[PDB]
Amino acid sequence: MISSLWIAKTGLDAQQTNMDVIANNLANVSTNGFKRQRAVFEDLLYQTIRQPGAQSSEQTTLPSGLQIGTGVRPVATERLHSQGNLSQTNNSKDVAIKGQGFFQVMLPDGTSAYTRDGSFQVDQNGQLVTAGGFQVQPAITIPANALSITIGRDGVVSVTQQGQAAPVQVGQLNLTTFMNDTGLESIGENLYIETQSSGAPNESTPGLNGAGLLYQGYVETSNVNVAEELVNMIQVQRAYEINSKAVSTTDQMLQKLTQL
Amino acid sequence: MISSLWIAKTGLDAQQTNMDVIANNLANVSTNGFKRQRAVFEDLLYQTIRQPGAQSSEQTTLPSGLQIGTGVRPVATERLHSQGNLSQTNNSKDVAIKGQGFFQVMLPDGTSAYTRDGSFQVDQNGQLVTAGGFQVQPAITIPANALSITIGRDGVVSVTQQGQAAPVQVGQLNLTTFMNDTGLESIGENLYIETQSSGAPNESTPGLNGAGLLYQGYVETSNVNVAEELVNMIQVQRAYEINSKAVSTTDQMLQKLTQL
Amino acid sequence: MISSLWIAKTGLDAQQTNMDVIANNLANVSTNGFKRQRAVFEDLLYQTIRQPGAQSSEQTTLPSGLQIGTGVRPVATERLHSQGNLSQTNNSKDVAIKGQGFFQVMLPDGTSAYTRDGSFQVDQNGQLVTAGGFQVQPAITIPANALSITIGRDGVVSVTQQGQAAPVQVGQLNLTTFMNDTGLESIGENLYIETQSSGAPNESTPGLNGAGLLYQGYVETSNVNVAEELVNMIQVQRAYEINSKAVSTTDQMLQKLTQL
Incomplete structure (x- = not known):
């Protein structure tokens, strides 16, 4: 209708998306x-009426031409892959990660997923398994008669059989490192999958090739700063205020246009 | 959104980091x-509006030019290495350092760390070792036939055997001093590794070379006096509250600007 | 549009800058x-209609003519250069200043900066340096075997060497004073640079030429009176409410002028 109303509508969409995030x-x-x-925004087309160059006379040049511009297209959403705070959970099946790396998992479809949740x-x-029957990889089989499971900072998992005075080594729990952690696609269930933005996965032992270490009895908390989130909430609410006010203003302009 | 909103958001982040530490x-x-x-802060940009110089006439100078300023960027959370108190554990294998000095430890990964804790x-x-396989330099092996172990205040550790009534020295436990005691980075278990910010660690025997003394049967308590850090908590909580008040004030600010 | 709306616009901008400060x-x-x-405000032009003098008759004079006036232009933001509270940080590497004076610093560009921060x-x-490799002036090198670094109240820095029982004089730490402390142009990083309104810098040893003393082991706190800032914030919230009411009244005047 008016060139202003579409712009304000894109603004409403942008604030709505940011509130969704x-x-x-x-x-x-x-x-x-x-x-x-964290959502990253970006403005769309600038419809130019006078080019910023476009010399008018033989000496004049018309600096800073007239172009209007529209929209706030949400160009992407990054994901902050920083180390989350560890908390002492005191469970032997909660393993957290200190440093870069992801546990590998076999989805029931046969393709492989990745996750930073050790609440096994x-x-x-x-x-x-991990809370959904997802077999960690490579498969680790705990013998029936074991009384405990110890998962060292080197990822070497062993159990204590009854009677035998030895922790027989039952496997090695290795991590996976991607070049672009942010580029992984999230599929829910706290599971990520491979995509070409991430790059080829590099499987490695914890400690080497820049992979992390394993902390048994710790859980890695979500790095959601409540303070930043609440201030973002205030700001997004007020931005939505302002953009709806813009829509209202253009609407009144149009209605007085119509009344004539 | 609003400049004051951004500035107060930075302030809330800074005071949240204060209360976190x-x-x-x-x-x-x-x-x-x-x-x-302790956390050390730093102010961000100063948006210049009128330059503090900006000769406003042939002769007028306009001192104290207007400029606004933003943000409270925290540069660091530095590590205060000050002398703390000592408590009586009455254990010969627990040693406390009085004055400057760091315990050398050969890290299990093959590097060098230091700790101000001598509960060997x-x-x-x-x-x-001391609660985690922390081996000192030079390596000292206690004879298996030892009866009693005594570590002198000068850094000499010795053992006593049956029959012979002579306290033959078995090892030397010397301290390590830093030009900068703060720049050390922790690697957990109160171990701090040599850092480019700490200065060259000089290996020096206790008593001489300007080092401190060793107390046997004592352990160095944390220098976290409850009274001082409670005072800090009260002050920081006030700062946090007032910053949040500024955020909500900018909110009410904008709300009345929109009810316009 | 309407003179009322321009005047009120300037009022809103002034209150916004005050709240930013x-x-x-x-x-x-x-x-x-x-x-x-602290922000200092300054009204804009006064558009005269009847001149305050302007003899009407051959004997009368028309005292106190009519002039309308606009605007609340914020003319300056002075920086209160008063001494802050010193607190006992107990670090051998933190030195505050008691009285006038700044630590000179050489920037990577080479131009002279100045800081009132002793977190060296x-x-x-x-x-x-100062928290970023900003090489302090004059050039000072702490020897590698130094143990304790003392910064005397006179301003001489000396180190405790390896073995030798002497705190050898290793450098001089001397301050700089300006005629106009308020004029220094802040550039962030807790740094001030000389400007043509601050006056030429005068370099001298601490304690002399009017400069202040050096307090080793202390840090100078920001001289921010929290309650004063709270009262200021309440006042500016009221003022902004009032100015928004003025804008609303002008807008309603206009609206039923057009509905006419």
Whole structure:
């Protein structure tokens, strides 16, 4: 209708998207291994009426031409892959990560996923799963008669059989490092998958190739700064205020145009 | 949005970091060998509106030009290395340092760390470690036939055997001094590794070379005096409240500007 | 549009700048050496209609003619250069100043900066810097075997060498005073640079030529009176409410002028 109303409508969309991101970040506190999301905006087309160059006379040049511009297209959303605060959970099946790296997982479809959540489990077969039956990889089988499981900072997992006075080594839990942590696609279930923005996964032992270490009895908390989220909430609410006010102003302009 | 909103957001971040380090410091009260960590801040941009010079006439000078300023960027959370108190544990294997000095430790990964905590122990192979396999330099092996172990205030550790009534020295436990005691970076367990900001660690025997003294049967408590850090908490809490008040004031600001 | 709306616009802008200053002061509590800021306002033009003199008859004079006037232009923001509270940081590497004076610093561009911050640090080459490798003036190098670094109230820095029982004089730490402390142009980083309104810098040893003393082991706190900032913030919230009411009244006047 008016060139102003479309611009204000894009502004409403941008503030709504940013509030969506804030709400998702806010709600996923107390979700282990969650990475705060941050939306990055970017303006669309500038429809030019007079080119910024475009010499008018033989001496004049017309500095700073007239172009109007529209829109606030949300160009991306990054994800902050910083180390989350560890907390002492005192459970032997909670393993957290100190440094870059992801646990690998086999999805039921056969393709591989990745996750930074160590709140593991043992299923009715004794294998190592994660809250959804997702077999960690490479498969780790805990013998039935084990009384404890110890997962060292080197990822070398061993169990203590009854009777035998030895922690028989039951496997090695290795991490995976990507070149672009932010580029991983999130599929829910606190699981990521491979995509060409991430790059080829580099599987490695914890400690080497820049991978992290493993802390048994710790859980990695979501790095959601409540203070920043709340100030963002205030600002987004006020920006939505202002943009709806712009829509209202253009609407009144149009209605007085119509009345004539 | 509004300039004051951005500036107060930076302030809220800064005071949240203050209270975070204060809470971490309370988390380590009565834990021997802990140092009161402190945060050092830094102001960001100053938006110049009128230059403080800006000759406004042939002769007029306009002193104290107008400029606004933003933000409270925290440069660092530095590590205060000050002398703390000593408590009586009455253990010969627990040593406390009085004055300047750091305990040399050969890290299990093969590097060098230092700690102001001397609750050493003896392992199965005789190496002098302290709650985590922290071996000192030079390597000292306690004889297996030892009866009593005594560590002198000068850094000499010795053992006594059956029959012979002579306290033959078995090892030298010398201190390590830093030009900069603060720049050290922790690697956990109160171990701090040599850093480019700490200065060259000079290996010097206790008593001589301007080092401190060794107290046997004593342990160095954390320098976290409850009274001082409670005073800090009260002040920082006031700062946090007033900054949040500025944020809400800018909110009410904008709300009345929009109810316009 | 309407003269009322322009005058009120300037009023809103002035109150906004005042709130910006208050918010910057409020955020910068607990920032070492920070100086409070105060905004000085200044009304704009007075558009005369009947001249205040302007003899009407051959004997009468028309006292107090009619002139309308506009605007509240904020003319300046002075920086209160009063001494802050010293607090016992107990660090051998933090030195505050008692009285007038700034630590000169050589920027990477080479131009002379000045800081009232005593959180000095040492780089990998051993010298004295300030939290970012800003090489203090005059050139000072702490020897590698130095143990304790004392900064005398006279301003001489000396180090405790390896073995030798002498605190060898290793450098001089001398301040700079200006005729116009308020005129220094802040550039962030807790740094002030000379401007043509500050006056030429005068270099002298601490304690002399009017400069202040050096207090080793202390840090100077920002001289921000929190309650004063609170009262200022309440006042500016009221003023902004009032000016928004003025804008609303002018707008309603216009609206039923057009509805006419």
